[PDB]
């Protein structure tokens, strides 16, 4: 007869008791006390312009119809209790295709104090959109949101605040980081305030502020460029008389600019602007296709003006690295502090 | 208290089996929608994917209660109690709503028996493309809901008077389109079991040309430029100017395959194919150019040094002529 | 070349309804987050309201109830109702753009800044 009285408890609180009715209808604003556990930060897809993130997305209310006495202070039930009273209907306002997680049960918590008070946690994968300016790739940085809130109602009915202080609202995992190619800096919480059709709704806005790592795109695409350039200004210290050496020289490192060209594009989503690893691409495509006109004009003016021809070799063994490396120097020196 | 009452007298032999007014006149539904995000435009596929909040109000007499209580705020619990419009998207290849952390809809009911449905949807709907101007092309995709078992004798559909609402209309994911505008009709489809009330939404995209530029017009440019170094070269050098010559053809054949991954397997030519098409007869002339000058090297030496002269001004001349006639007509004449 | 062009504001007596305007030229900032900033002489640069893609709205503790953010993103312009104005809202008013990154609150997260409207209020 243990757990016999534990029975009648429960069957006395959801006698009568009407799942339809928020607490405190026509009497009060029901508060919900949010608090957010970020158990991993998982990768940002730059192609979907979109981020996954798994959480133990905790709420609490009371609810004044669920007051007990008994010698437990706390009645830490199944889950299933959890469907047959009264739950918000938060929701996320940026939120695509989310898992509610079921393996090996329903990733769910209901627990009630004897003054009504509950408290209800679950397990999520959250898919929000992240709107993203890359302008500045891949030296961007991205501040991602994480908006919620109540779908049926407005802000006289239910409101929505943080267990805690904000900042310490939302905690992230110490080891949860799944990013392969980002950095957490930190996240910023605040609560705001959005007017739709049917009313004015509370909702709750967290953003991370991600910076990109540049790493992956130096092995990449950077020192193939770097290189090509380098590569085809050897030409100019070979003798005038090696037409055919030349020009397999000038002919292969423009059509090695063309491919990295096209290959650097494939990471990105396809917009319509030019980005910072485009203007270097731009550029190091110049230096490549102006050497080989420098060797179309040696080569011309060679057998008439041998003399013109030498000068113009000479020079240009100085000013075409002088100038790649002066760009070099402005160019990173400009995206790296922005 | 009391609501606890009203409800339980409300779904007091209910039938949601039954419309209202089943046998009166038809049940008269106006639909809004706000536009979240009109997702990506997959040209591959020919589809788009809608984010939206869909709105329905009707009347139902078998609701109305007298009280000091206007209107009845509940959720996604009494959805399934009372009669429901069998609304669905026509065009629509795979839709959901959304699940999480409840179901997202929204029920409000008045005291005179309006009802006020809610739900958020996510559509992929079918949006067929001509691709004939391609990548200058301007398309009409539509989103078309009617109702799936009730023929115009019983339900009517109506817009209501500011119908599709959008917010931040760049914010949407439409990387290579911007919209333009949106038409909201109302037409009749006669199908084979009855005459169904079809409402539909229009929205004209308009394609951007910036990717396309860095993507394949400059190299395709830059690679005829490429071949023309071949005409300050001197003829002697035989091996030197067929080099230039054979990897500028191979090149530009590589180009013409990669431009068009992006584009369905049709079968007709876009503008995108006329643009590579003659970009490949200029390389692949300048070629023969340099094969007719070396047969006539020994014959004709005088000669052939007119041959070259010429081809640094009409080749660069007939490109430049080329462009002009090119964006000027899928530019200004469609 | 953006220019965050602000009309509006003014001299305003016993309170009442002072709506300031912003209009965004020269670039779209419908993605970007427009925002409301008040600097009294002196005193330091205050965060007032902000308006993301979202439409969102996100008030100062100061001013919350009282002053209204709204965006025309049609016409690429964000206003703000000035209501039951004081004396401590004498100030001149800014407008401002960003992405938001490292907080919306914070003035330094805004890459594009107007020229400035003085409100008066007099009492």
């Known amino acids: 007869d243990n757990t016999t009285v534990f029975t009648r408890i429960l069957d006395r609180l959801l006698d009568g008791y009407d799942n339809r009715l928020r607490p405190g209808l026509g009497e009060r604003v029901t508060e919900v006390k949010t608090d957010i556990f970020v158990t991993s930060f998982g990768p940002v897809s730059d192609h979907d312009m979109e981020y996954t993130i798994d959480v133990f997305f905790r709420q609490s209310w009371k609810d004044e119809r669920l007051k007990f006495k008994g010698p437990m202070t706390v009645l830490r039930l199944n889950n299933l209790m959890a469907s047959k009273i009264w739950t918000p209907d938060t929701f996320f306002h940026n939120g695509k295709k989310s898992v509610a997680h079921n393996m090996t049960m329903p990733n769910k918590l209901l627990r009630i104090t004897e003054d009504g008070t509950l408290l209800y946690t679950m397990r999520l994968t959250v898919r929000a959109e992240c709107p993203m300016h890359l302008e500045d790739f891949p030296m961007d940085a991205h501040a991602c949101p994480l908006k919620f809130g109540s779908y049926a109602y407005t802000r006289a009915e239910v409101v929505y605040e943080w267990t805690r202080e904000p900042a310490r609202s939302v905690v992230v995992a110490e080891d949860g980081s799944r990013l392969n190619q980002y950095d957490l800096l930190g996240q910023t919480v605040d609560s705001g305030i959005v007017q739709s059709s049917t009313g004015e709704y509370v909702v709750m806005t967290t953003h991370f502020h991600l910076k990109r790592k540049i790493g992956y795109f130096v092995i990449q695409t950077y020192l193939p460029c770097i290189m090509t350039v380098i590569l085809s200004q050897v030409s100019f210290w070979l003798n005038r008389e090696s037409v055919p050496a030349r020009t397999v020289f000038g002919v292969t490192t423009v059509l090695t600019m063309t491919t990295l060209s096209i290959s650097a594009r494939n990471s990105l989503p396809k917009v319509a602007y030019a980005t910072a690893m485009d203007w270097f691409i731009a550029v190091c495509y110049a230096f490549v296709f102006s050497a080989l006109i420098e060797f179309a004009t040696v080569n011309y003016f060679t057998k008439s003006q041998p003399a013109r021809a030498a000068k113009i070799d000479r020079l240009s063994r100085i000013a075409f690295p002088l100038l790649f490396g002066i760009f070099n120097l402005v160019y990173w020196a400009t995206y790296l502090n922005r | 208290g009391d609501v606890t009452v009203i409800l339980n007298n409300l779904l007091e032999g209910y039938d949601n089996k039954l419309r209202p007014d089943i046998g009166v006149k038809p049940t008269l539904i106006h639909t809004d929608m706000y536009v979240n995000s009109i997702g990506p435009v997959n040209a591959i596929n020919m589809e788009y994917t809608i984010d939206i909040f869909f709105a329905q109000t009707w009347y139902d007499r078998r609701l109305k209660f007298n009280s000091t209580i206007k209107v009845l705020r509940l959720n996604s619990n009494m959805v399934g109690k009372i009669w429901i419009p069998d609304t669905f998207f026509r065009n629509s290849k795979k839709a959901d709503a959304h699940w999480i952390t409840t179901p997202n809809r929204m029920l409000r009911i008045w005291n005179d028996g309006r009802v006020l449905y809610t739900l958020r949807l996510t559509i992929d709907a079918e949006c067929q493309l001509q691709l004939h101007n391609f990548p200058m092309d301007e398309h009409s995709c539509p989103l078309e809901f009617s109702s799936y078992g009730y023929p115009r004798e019983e339900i009517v559909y109506q817009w209501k008077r500011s119908s599709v609402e959008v917010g931040d209309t760049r914010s949407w994911r439409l990387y290579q389109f911007s919209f333009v505008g949106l038409r909201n009709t109302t037409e009749v489809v006669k199908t084979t079991s009855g005459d169904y009330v079809v409402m539909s939404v229009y929205f004209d995209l308009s394609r951007r040309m910036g990717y396309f530029t860095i993507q394949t017009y400059i190299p395709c440019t830059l690679i005829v430029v490429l071949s023309w170094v071949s005409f300050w070269i001197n003829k002697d050098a035989v091996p030197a100017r067929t080099s230039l010559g054979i990897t500028t053809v191979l090149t530009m054949t590589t180009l013409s395959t990669i431009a068009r991954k992006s584009l369905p397997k049709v079968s007709y030519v876009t503008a995108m194919d006329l643009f590579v098409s003659v970009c490949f007869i200029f390389v692949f002339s300048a070629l023969v150019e340099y094969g007719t000058l070396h047969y006539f090297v020994s014959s004709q030496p005088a000669r052939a040094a007119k041959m070259d002269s010429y081809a640094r001004i009409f080749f660069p001349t007939a490109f430049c002529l080329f462009n002009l006639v090119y964006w000027v007509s899928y530019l200004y004449l469609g | 070349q953006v220019q965050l062009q602000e009309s509006g504001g003014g001299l305003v007596q016993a309170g009442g309804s002072l709506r300031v305007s912003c209009a965004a030229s020269?670039?779209?900032?419908?993605?970007?987050?427009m925002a409301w900033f008040r600097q009294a002489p002196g005193k330091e640069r205050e965060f007032l309201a902000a308006?993301?893609?979202?439409?969102?709205?996100y008030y100062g503790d100061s001013v919350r109830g009282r002053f209204t953010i709204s965006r025309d993103y049609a016409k690429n312009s964000v206003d703000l109702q000035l209501d039951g104005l004081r004396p401590e809202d004498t100030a001149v008013y800014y407008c401002?753009?960003?992405?938001?990154?490292?907080?919306?609150?914070?003035?330094?997260?805004?890459?594009?800044w107007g020229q400035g409207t003085q409100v008066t209020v007099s009492s």
């Open positions: 401002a753009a960003g992405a938001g990154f490292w907080g919306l609150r914070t003035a330094s997260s805004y890459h594009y």
């Open positions: 308006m993301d893609q979202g439409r969102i709205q």
């Open positions: 020269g670039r779209t900032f419908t993605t970007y987050i």
